[PDB]
Amino acid sequence: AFNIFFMVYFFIRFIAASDKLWFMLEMYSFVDYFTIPPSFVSIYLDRTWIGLRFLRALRLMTVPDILQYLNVLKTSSSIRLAQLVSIFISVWLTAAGIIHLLENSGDPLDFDNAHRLSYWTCVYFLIVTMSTVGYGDVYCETVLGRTFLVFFLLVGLAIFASCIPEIIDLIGTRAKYGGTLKNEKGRRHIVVCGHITYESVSHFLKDFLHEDREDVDVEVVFLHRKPPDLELEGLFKRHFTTVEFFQGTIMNPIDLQRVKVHEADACLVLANKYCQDPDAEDAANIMRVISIKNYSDDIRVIIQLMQYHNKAYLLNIPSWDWKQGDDVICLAELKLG
Amino acid sequence: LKVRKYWCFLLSSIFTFLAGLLVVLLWRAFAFVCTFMTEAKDWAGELISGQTTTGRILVVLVFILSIASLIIYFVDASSEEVERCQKWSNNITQQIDLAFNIFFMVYFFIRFIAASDKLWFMLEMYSFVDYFTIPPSFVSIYLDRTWIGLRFLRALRLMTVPDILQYLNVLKTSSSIRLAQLVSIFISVWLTAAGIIHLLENSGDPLDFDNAHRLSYWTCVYFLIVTMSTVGYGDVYCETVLGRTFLVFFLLVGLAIFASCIPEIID
């Protein structure tokens, strides 16, 4: 009865097929031609067999398509991985049906070397074959069945090594720096932004995390746009308990939320001493303070400034208060002073 | 074995596991429209954020004795019987496992009483194991019969072992800690899966209860070590239908898990 409105269902595909010839070998139509006549088989001789109806498992490859219709998996990335698992299950199940048929029926010549195998065993047979484990407790005995194992392993390995090594490998790779800063009860921390290099961070960490400093625990959060290099990565490893790095920009409001600016005690901005244009570096550093002050008014900001004449620009910020704790460290004025 | 009795033992595990599903979800959300607070601050440091003695002392007695609980589980794991009956008065180890769990099932209370998340804490990995092992403690007290149980899940406590190593400063470097993490899950998953294999094979299928193959825990660990390496000697293999279903699932999820983190961080 299910096939009654399925073999007329194929008619609507065949009646108005755009390609009258290329539609002959289409994957979904190919299965039906081997399953529709079996429907007529059980009506003229009163005898039914296992048949090729196990090929209906190939309809599972359309299952992810309906999931798009129901909006279960809206993202395209999830759809692509949902595709591959659909063929994997469909191929695994339809091959077990072939194994079940090629073993229980037996060879057409002698019809005596038939081994009783269950479909629950056939799926267990192939799952350990694909994993290349090979327990050997269950194995194929029919000559025709043995020929399939030789072919299907050969075509299966080639198919496995044709798409998975190129598209599955891309999905696995992901970034290692990111995510919201971990929160702790009674956690005091500061945010350091600006120029983040080895010989600049190390000097600051020597004094801030000094050996003889009396016991106060303040975490240090570094927010730099570029990922750290190997020279600086080792420095963070030696201070893993008190120093954490996050990839982002202090100018991005989203990245400000990631480092929990409003929870920070103070914000520190470092200046690039080796810059061709000190005025350009100072302008960028000052503009970082504006972003921090815009996000939170009552935040303490300490900035390294290259030139003395750029101090006046920081006074133009309405939220900049020297009495509240904001302070400017001018390298040129202090060094030559 | 007169009649099956592990079904109600698991039902008791089901009762307590689903008890949190009912006692918590029915009461928490009613107070929004219109002690717990003090002890939570201590418990956060008493269990997790302990530096010198608030957390370390409590942590030491939960994983060392869990390993001891695993050790005393091995002596009954090596036993041929899966559900044996014995007088629980003065056995060699029947008193200790219950006694160890006596201050473990009230230990879970301090986690549950002052849990920051009343609902999200239901499925946490360490709390998930207890809900399937705490009611088994009550199992052996009302019918005088003890079985293999789900106490093999205590092997998942080995994933906390590297955390204590940080407390004792055995592995100071962060790089050594990261690799020490991965080996901890690898051993914990390997041992806990062997316990499932031991239970799914010795107990047998619930329907017929005749196709049960005698397998030892020493054999089960050897069974999976060659399966993970994809060698497959075949000298030992699973015969139970339920056990065979696990091999199909665990290889599939194991290969996906193996190919999800090792290729990116181990490399």
Ligand SMILES: [K+]
């Ligand atoms: K093999």
Ligand SMILES: [K+]
């Ligand atoms: K093998």
